[PDB]
């Protein structure tokens, strides 16, 4: 279990970096 | 590094040292003090007057309990200051004899419960056993029977009652681990 | 850097080279048991068979 | 004894022939260690994907 | 075909200092026929190591000839723009001249090539047997492994029974190499009956090895089934020293016989282990297994012997006898005490459920070891 | 040439402390100084080897000095002075700026910014002097400003993160000094040496910083080894104050290292089995780490065949480090097999490289243990053996001698027999069977707590991760 | 370098032997603060009867002990 949630943490990190730059050039 | 510490004095300190805490039947410290001397002072000086407490110890480690005995007699000609060690030593050493010998058999010989232990006399065997509280029917030492109620005593006191682990208390341990 | 940090303490136990000071210093076992075995054999043959 | 009709021992120095039940040996612990051997390649292969993480 | 695998089984025995003087010399003039002939230049060069200019003219020659020959064919068959056919062919093609010579490093490159580009499965698995002889060519055997990990992913997905058999026979001498006899058995057995040689050995040499493993592994109620009532074994019968050597030890094995028994050992010792190529290196090995198995078998039935009796009958004095037992004991196979005042052998058997608490806590101990540390290192990532 | 290197190393080191200047003024980031301090270091000794490594001399230049100055002075007349921009505040591009540092402000004595600052070059001073292998004069400076330097100056929960770096470098240089060379005067420092780490110590207790409190413990317990104090350090460990539950694992390695070897000697195994299998494994596999590996498995061996187990011959079989652990590998051959003339000349061959390490006085311990292996096999193998054929076979001086070995033998019960005297042999007792008996529970008890405590460390950690990147932006 | 002297001097009935020895204790205690502490109920004597003469000073010691090894509680 521990590593099936820790995946899909990995995944929301690289997602996260990403959308933060875009709500910059939105802003 | 070196003062004028090095002396002929200080190897034949050093080896009534060791004796001493070897007749305290303390082994803990002996290897500690030991483990002290194992560098630079025990190389230099070679083993000489230090041979005689390594050897001492050693051979009673090793379970040639002959060897050890051998080094205690042949003492005599060295004596100054050593016999005071010399002697609560060997009273030590029948005693660690008659313990080992213990599980081994129950019943020896009169003539063998002497070679033993190294008594020079039959009457002094017998004056171990009282101490010992062990008894003497038809000149044959009983092992078994005090040493066993003895230990059966012993084994009930408030430390190890705590450490016994009873076979109900595992189950609430491990069932409530899991549930928590 | 969890890793970094466990090599650096190390190295004083390590010294200078704990991994090549040394070597600059510096059924499997039994051997052919046929060879012993033969020759037993023989041995005992021999006897054996004059007797 | 050695195609197991009778399975029992022969006593050459008494001049007897002794006679055994079959045994039967413990179902449960045969069968455990079969379970246990198979946990071991599961977590293998875990931890192979688990390289991704690291 | 024939120097692919023959190659090294004369060769290694020219390695050994092991075997007799005549054998050696026998083997030397059969390797230099054959350096000539398939013109393995390169490859000798590793193998002199281990062990005329006109030869290395042969290579500069057949090497420029064999290489233009192929250059401007192989060009002309990409060029001429169809790759399904051609340009796939091509490739095989290129990997077989460097298999030739043993240039292991530009045929991984060739035959790579035909793998990755779209093919029919059966032409795949095809295609990667020849790497995995390579390895088994070269005597590393954990580059044959990685190999035959792919191949069996494959072989359900063609589902061509042919290559099922070939696919066995490879990883059947793969397992004959390493330790563990226990595979090797199983897929040895069918292959008695079936399997065309391809670039393996022949048939006279893999009868040999189903009788070996045969003995080593199996309960007794199976070697009889199986092997000596084989119907392969029957027809084959011998026409080798090496496949006598190993029947007449089966006879007595099963049959219960003794004063014989020792004689058969030390026959199959020089006629089977040592010209094999990949059991040599088992020869202590083996024999202390048959050893302790022999020894076991009689102990089984009887809860005592004498010495004298158990000594005369394997044909060694009372004194051989004893010392070797002793050797045996303390690795639990035997499962016997030995009076020496009353001069008995007494059988003890005490496995029950004992025996088989002992194995799950032991294996036990490993599973929560591993899982400590994977635990671990999750969960500081 | 000179010029742009220098220049470039300067700024690197610019941008670095920028970052931390930042972090270490807010709050309690505590953790996000510690890491980046800890990367920074590794960093900083990878870059000396290309680009110039005179970043110290640069980074000096231009920073308040407030004894750096003279440190840096004396590093220069170490190495053959030169003058060509050397004497810092040469450059004036700090400007009262708050980053660079205001520099009216420091001089005014209003505000303090150099106290962090001059912790962190003391760090940057002592790795490129280890690195480069500048001894005598320097190391003793070095140690001479540093000591009270930090106790000039008051504690802060960043300032312990700090000097839990610089006590590793004081202990250490010194030990350099011993290492060169033997002076009257190593003797005596030795001495001053401990002082000031026992009372940084004692200090560091009341700050509740653990990061320092391992560290110290562990550089404290090295020394007392090297002079095999045991009575010393058996008092020293009963203090138990020694943190695990926020400190590296590295610190934990290297205390159970010292534990296995404190413990083995004076005649405890039991305990110190558990300790050295621990240490191995938290020990990283590291290629830089391969040579504290090799000293592990040598006290492994060692703690084993005292306790009269067989380390796995599978376990070395595979291993690497071959050359260096021949020597253990033939000890445990001769117990292995009960030997006894194998012993003593294996002994006597290898003593020197087994002296170094100081497992040699182990190695004589062993010798009761061939003795007690070789008659495990006699017994194992028989059920009445005359006590005369054990006479010749293992060449035992007397009939009164050979009954002494398995008279002792059997009172920790390794063989557990019976000696008939008059009947004049031994006769097996053995169990053998012990699944009969209450023995099953106990061992099932430790694989069964073992279990447990991995699902609750699973638990708290799972949670943890997934909430930082919740809050954070996200589809 | 250890106390072990230190101690054994104070079993001495011979009150100027004993009052020496308090003060050298006083000066190693900063390490010492372990060894001295399997003697450390001697010293304690030594201050709960009156018969002592340099009572306060071997209170102080044993007081210094009490706060290196943390027992805040007897150290104050």
Request: aromatic share 10%; with cysteine.
């Amino acid at each position: 279990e521990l590593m099936v949630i820790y995946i899909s943490n990995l995944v929301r990190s690289i997602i996260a970096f990403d959308d933060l730059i875009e709500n910059k050039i939105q802003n | 590094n070196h003062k004028l510490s090095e002396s002929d004095k200080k190897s034949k300190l050093i080896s009534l040292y060791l004796l001493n805490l070897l007749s305290q039947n303390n082994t803990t410290k002996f290897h500690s003090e030991l483990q002290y001397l194992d560098k630079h002072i025990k190389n230099l000086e070679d083993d000489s007057l230090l041979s005689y407490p390594i050897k001492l110890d050693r051979w009673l480690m090793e379970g040639s309990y002959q060897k050890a005995w051998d080094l205690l007699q042949s003492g005599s000609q060295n004596i100054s200051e050593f016999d005071s060690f010399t002697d609560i030593l060997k009273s030590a050493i029948r005693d660690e004899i008659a313990k080992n010998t213990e599980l081994s058999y129950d019943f020896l010989p009169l003539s063998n419960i002497k070679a033993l232990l190294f008594f020079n006399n039959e009457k002094e065997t017998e004056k171990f056993a009282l101490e010992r509280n062990w008894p003497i029917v038809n000149s044959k030492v009983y092992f078994n029977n005090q040493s066993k109620e003895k230990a059966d005593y012993e084994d009930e006191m408030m430390h190890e009652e705590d450490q016994k682990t009873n076979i109900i208390e595992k189950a609430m341990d491990y069932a409530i681990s899991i549930e928590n | 850097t969890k890793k970094k940090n466990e090599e650096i303490n190390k190295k004083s136990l390590e010294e200078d080279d704990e991994f090549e000071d040394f070597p600059i210093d510096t059924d499997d076992v039994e051997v052919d048991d046929d060879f012993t075995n033969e020759l037993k054999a023989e041995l005992d043959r021999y006897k054996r068979e004059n007797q | 004894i050695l195609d197991k009709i009778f399975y029992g021992v022969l006593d050459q120095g008494n001049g007897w022939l002794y006679v055994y039940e079959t045994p039967n040996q413990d179902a449960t612990y045969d069968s455990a260690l079969e379970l246990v051997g198979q946990l071991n390649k599961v977590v293998d292969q875990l931890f192979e994907k688990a390289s991704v993480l690291y | 075909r024939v120097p692919n695998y023959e190659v090294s089984e004369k060769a290694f025995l020219l390695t050994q200092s092991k075997v007799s003087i005549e054998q050696r010399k026998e083997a030397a003039e059969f390797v230099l026929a054959k350096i000539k002939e398939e013109e393995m230049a390169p490859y000798y060069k590793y193998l002199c190591e281990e062990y005329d200019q006109e030869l290395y003219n042969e290579l500069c020659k057949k090497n420029e000839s064999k290489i233009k020959e192929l250059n401007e064919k192989i060009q002309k068959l990409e060029e001429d723009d169809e790759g399904e056919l051609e340009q796939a062919q091509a490739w095989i093609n290129l990997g077989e001249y460097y298999a030739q010579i043993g240039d292991k490093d530009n045929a991984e490159k060739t035959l790579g090539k035909s793998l990755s580009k779209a093919i029919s499965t059966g032409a795949k698995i095809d295609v990667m047997l020849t790497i995995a002889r390579l390895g088994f060519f070269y005597n590393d055997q954990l580059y044959v492994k990685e190999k035959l990990e792919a191949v069996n992913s494959m072989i359900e997905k063609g589902g061509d029974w042919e290559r099922r058999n070939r696919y066995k026979t490879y990883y059947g001498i793969h397992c004959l190499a390493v330790r563990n006899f226990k595979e090797a058995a199983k897929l040895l057995v069918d292959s008695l009956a079936t399997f065309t040689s391809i670039e393996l050995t022949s048939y006279e040499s893999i009868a040999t090895y189903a009788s070996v493993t045969g003995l080593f592994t199996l309960e007794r109620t199976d070697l009889k089934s199986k092997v000596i009532d084989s119907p392969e074994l029957l027809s084959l019968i011998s026409t080798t020293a090496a496949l006598q050597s190993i029947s007449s030890l089966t006879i007595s094995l099963y049959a219960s016989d003794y004063a014989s028994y020792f004689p058969y050992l030390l026959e199959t010792y020089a006629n089977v282990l040592i010209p094999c190529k990949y059991l040599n290196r088992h020869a202590d090995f083996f024999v202390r297994e048959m050893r302790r198995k022999v020894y076991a078998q009689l102990l089984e039935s009887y809860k005592t012997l004498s010495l004298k009796s158990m000594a005369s009958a394997f044909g060694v004095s009372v004194a051989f006898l004893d010392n070797d037992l002793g050797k045996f004991i303390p690795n639990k196979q035997l499962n016997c005490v030995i009076d020496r005042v009353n001069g008995i052998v007494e059988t003890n058997r005490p496995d029950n459920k004992n025996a088989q608490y002992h194995l799950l806590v032991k294996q036990g101990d490993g599973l929560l070891t591993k899982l400590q540390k994977y635990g671990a290192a999750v969960r500081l990532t | 040439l000179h010029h742009s290197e220098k220049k470039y190393a300067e700024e690197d080191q610019v941008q670095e402390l920028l970052k931390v200047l930042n972090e270490i003024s807010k709050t309690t980031l505590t953790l996000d100084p510690r890491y980046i301090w800890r990367s920074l270091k590794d960093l900083s000794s990878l870059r000396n080897q290309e680009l110039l490594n005179a970043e110290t001399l640069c980074f000096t230049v231009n920073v308040l000095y407030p004894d750096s100055s003279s440190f840096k002075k004396n590093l220069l007349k170490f190495i053959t002075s030169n003058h060509k921009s050397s004497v810092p505040g040469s450059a004036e591009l700090r400007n009262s700026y708050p980053a660079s540092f205001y520099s009216v402000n420091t001089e005014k004595k209003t505000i303090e910014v150099t106290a962090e600052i001059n912790c962190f070059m003391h760090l940057l001073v002592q790795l490129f002097l280890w690195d480069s292998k500048e001894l005598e004069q320097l190391v003793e400076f070095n140690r001479k400003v540093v000591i009270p330097n930090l106790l000039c100056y008051y504690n802060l929960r960043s300032l312990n993160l700090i000097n839990a770096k610089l006590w590793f470098y004081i202990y250490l240089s010194h030990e350099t000094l011993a290492r060169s060379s033997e002076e009257i005067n190593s003797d005596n420092q030795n001495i001053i040496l401990r002082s000031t780490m026992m009372k940084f110590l004692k200090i560091a207790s009341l700050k509740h910083d653990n990061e320092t409190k391992a560290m110290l413990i562990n550089l404290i317990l090295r020394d007392f080894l090297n002079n095999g104090e045991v009575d010393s350090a058996s008092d020293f460990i009963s203090k138990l104050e020694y943190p695990h539950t926020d400190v590296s694992s590295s610190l934990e390695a290297r205390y159970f290292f010292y534990l296995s070897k404190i413990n083995a000697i004076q005649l405890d195994y039991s305990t110190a089995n558990e300790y050295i299998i621990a240490a191995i494994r938290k020990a990283p596999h590291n290629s830089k780490s391969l040579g504290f590996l090799q000293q592990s498995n040598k006290l492994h061996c060692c703690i084993q065949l005292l306790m009269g187990d067989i380390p796995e011959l599978s376990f070395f079989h595979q291993s690497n480090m071959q050359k260096s652990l021949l020597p253990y590998y033939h000890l445990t051959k001769a117990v292995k097999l009960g030997d006894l003339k194998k012993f003593t000349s294996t002994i006597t061959k290898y003593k020197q490289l087994l002296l170094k390490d100081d497992t040699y006085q182990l190695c004589v311990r062993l010798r009761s243990n061939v003795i007690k292996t070789g008659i495990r096999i006699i017994s194992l193998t028989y059920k009445k053996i005359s006590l005369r054929d054990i006479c010749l076979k293992l060449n035992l001086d007397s009939e009164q001698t050979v009954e002494y070995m398995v008279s002792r033998a059997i009172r920790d019960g390794v063989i557990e027999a019976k000696i008939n005297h008059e009947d004049g042999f031994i006769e097996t007792t053995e169990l053998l069977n012990i699944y009969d008996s209450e023995d099953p529970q106990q061992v099932f008890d430790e694989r069964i707590k073992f279990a447990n405590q991995l699902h609750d460390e699973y638990l708290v950690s799972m949670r943890y991760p997934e909430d930082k990147k919740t809050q954070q932006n996200e589809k | 370098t250890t106390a072990a002297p230190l101690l054994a001097l104070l079993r001495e009935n011979q009150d100027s032997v004993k009052t020496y020895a308090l003060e050298s204790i006083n000066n190693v205690v900063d390490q010492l603060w372990s060894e001295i502490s399997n003697e450390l109920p001697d010293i304690e004597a030594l201050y709960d009867d009156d018969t002592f003469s340099d009572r306060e000073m071997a209170a102080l010691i044993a007081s210094k002990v009490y706060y290196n090894l943390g027992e805040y509680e007897s150290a104050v």
